[PDB]
Design a protein around this ligand. Sequence first.
Ligand SMILES: Nc1nc2c(ncn2[C@@H]2O[C@H](COP(=O)(O)OP(=O)(O)O)[C@@H](O)[C@H]2O)c(=O)[nH]1
Lengths: 450, 467
Amino acid sequence: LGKDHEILRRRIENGAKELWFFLQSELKKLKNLEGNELQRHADEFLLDLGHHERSIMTDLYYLSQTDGAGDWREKEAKDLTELVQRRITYLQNPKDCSKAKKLVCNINKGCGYGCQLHHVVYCFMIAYGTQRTLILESQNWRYATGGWETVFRPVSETCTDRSGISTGHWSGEVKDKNVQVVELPIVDSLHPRPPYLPLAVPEDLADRLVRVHGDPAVWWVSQFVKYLIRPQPWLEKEIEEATKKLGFKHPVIGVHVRRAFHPIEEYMVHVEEHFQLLARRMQVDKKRVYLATDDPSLLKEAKTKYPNYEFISDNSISWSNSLRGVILDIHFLSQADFLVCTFSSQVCRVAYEIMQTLHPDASANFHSLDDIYYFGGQNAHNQIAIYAHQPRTADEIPMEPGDIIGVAGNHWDGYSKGVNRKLGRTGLYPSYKVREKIETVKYPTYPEAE
Amino acid sequence: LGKDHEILRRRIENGAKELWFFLQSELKKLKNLEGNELQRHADEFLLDLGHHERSIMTDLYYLSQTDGAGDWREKEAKDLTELVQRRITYLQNPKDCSKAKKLVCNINKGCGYGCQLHHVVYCFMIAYGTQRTLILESQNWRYATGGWETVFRPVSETCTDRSGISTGHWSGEVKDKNVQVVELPIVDSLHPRPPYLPLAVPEDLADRLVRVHGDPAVWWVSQFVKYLIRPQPWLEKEIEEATKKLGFKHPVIGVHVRRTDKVGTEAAFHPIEEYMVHVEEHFQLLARRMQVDKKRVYLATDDPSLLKEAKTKYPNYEFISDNSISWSAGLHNRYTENSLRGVILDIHFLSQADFLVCTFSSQVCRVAYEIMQTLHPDASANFHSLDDIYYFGGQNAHNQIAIYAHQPRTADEIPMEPGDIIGVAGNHWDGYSKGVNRKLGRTGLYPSYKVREKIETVKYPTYPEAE
Ligand SMILES: Nc1nc2c(ncn2[C@@H]2O[C@H](COP(=O)(O)OP(=O)(O)O)[C@@H](O)[C@H]2O)c(=O)[nH]1
């Protein structure tokens, strides 16, 4: 079993049991207070609970590493990504470009960099699913006159032209089985939708992925992000020089403030709380925050309000134009130990996706002030109720074990919101009473890549 | 790495994180309420928290069993107990009793059955530690004139006579090395004390025991209880027949309500409701993972009127109890073979239950809890005590080690730094324990989660010839 594994499991269990003893006793006392005394005691109660809750979280972290688990998870995550990158690379580099099935993707969607990048990711996932080589059209790119390849590696070494014996607009994989070159539109108008879309995961990888990673959907998205953003040597060098110039070092928490309005304190409470967690398992000499924002006055405000934090930020005037800022910001957010921001932002999502490629399982190393993780155009995100729920208020929905719940969001207060598809009712339910429903799709497995 | 293990670990982690989201949000709302509305919301809050906390505990239970862990823990616990029983049996059965080193123990300490049995255990552990065959003197035992063997097997198949070429009172292992027969008195005045006492565990078993079991000290005590209470054939048949006549079936929770002479002197009176709160909560835990058709309680008590009171107050529970045994425990009748049979049976069924609610100040409940350790791989946490933590009368000081610093909020609390040795007096079951910080010489309250147990070890003989 492992002595440390057993010691830690029992200490998590006893720690939670002592938490419950404490909760019952203190809540019973809180019932008899009022006014200011009630607030004093409730606030002390909260402070005590936080440290206690973090000791449980710290033991759970140690449990995840103990008795070789950390090393095994790292090796397996490495094997999985090398497997997928090998398949993508095999698909992308046919020997005869003239006879390859192709899918043509135009990068120049009318939106920002993160949205354009996710459009290429969506093209790539469908190309992978249909066994078509992705051809990326990037001329007249707003972010770089020379196009994609002046900044990132070409998505193929052997096949970058869209020539073929037959060309057509996407009409479905079977309908298109004999069209060599298929042009794919933006996801918003895609008809018919193939199954090769988030949040599903390939069947042949699903079992291994669940063993390794807490959100396989994001891991799967991130393999395509990883391949796409292979940087040219000069950009790799620029990122290296910025790291030294900015003093970007660990531990560091990334904060992306996109401008509902959220005040800086709403981000920073989660920053501080995560640094308290980290201090239980490592020495934190300086609390470093990488701040990405489109508000030029926010940086000054953060430094003044949090003088014990070192705020690192990118105020690049030139390279050593907006493309420079977004690349550096996404890079440093993705490299942080924890990410605080609103997943409604594509930039925040991109950083979180890239972060998955830097650790065996970074799925939980974020806090979003609004949305849960999603991919624009994804199929319905469903959960499965595991425990019954009886609504206490009219804003809550009932659940029985097995009910399919279409989740709209997590309110980060103990409750989530969604629709109970068995009942046709929408409302609030306790977040702990459902589990994620991992969707799978039969993808090609490209055995020839091995 | 096993898939279920990973799924469960993550759900425990996410379950706790959601618990913390819920705590912060709901406490913020409670701060703005007062009076009756505050009391209603607090009570709903408590109800919601209980189900949520039990989901976390249920996932932790599954984690302990998953991916072969349950099978492995069961086999290793079985290998450990077979090893120790084999060593004890080897010690207890020398080839020539007339040439064997012996330790003589008299069962008739001036106290009740559990205290007397624990005296024999203390004798036995010292005999095992000193490589002396235990000789149990039990004639004129207050519970049975005919002695231990009227109910239990003799503690040896080959060596029950106390004779030898030399006999002496205990004076220590080195001094007594050439005394064939050593007489051991009660623990209260033993000098010099040997190290073979609770709560320490043998060095040679400590690592394996920490791997399998949440309280090795009790497991070690329980091996000697297990050997001692091997039943005579007639008692074995009686226990089997009582099991069938009582309808004793699982799941069942054992409740020992000790009253009579215990109250005031060594413990307090506790009303039935204080026991049943913990019974009800544990059945709520069990219903998470199994079907509970009937909520069964095995009630052992020295109060004969309690059974009817309990049935009336808890009409949806099935109370399994022998009310003639409760009467047999009355003070005037207590030291009789009738009463002995009753307390052996009550302790047996308590020990067989899936969970135990009692007052550990009573030796009866501690015996049941010790026996329970021999029936499961790790039953160390399957109790709730209304007063004391587990202890063994005569043990060496029970110490803990602070793992997280504590800064006192009230005058009743003690400070702690990591590494401080804390002498625990008790757990108040409210988040705080009480003890002395030995570094500071200060006594008071500290958060129970901020210490770990200090497992003590002693070099014992290993009887390699027993293999
Ligand atoms: N059968 C039975 N006898 C009991 C019960 N409670 C107390 N007694 C009797 O009272 C004695 C109490 O002495 P002891 O075992 O040393 O435990 P303590 O006095 O409770 O710490 C027991 O040994 C029994 O003889 C009970 O629940 N059932």
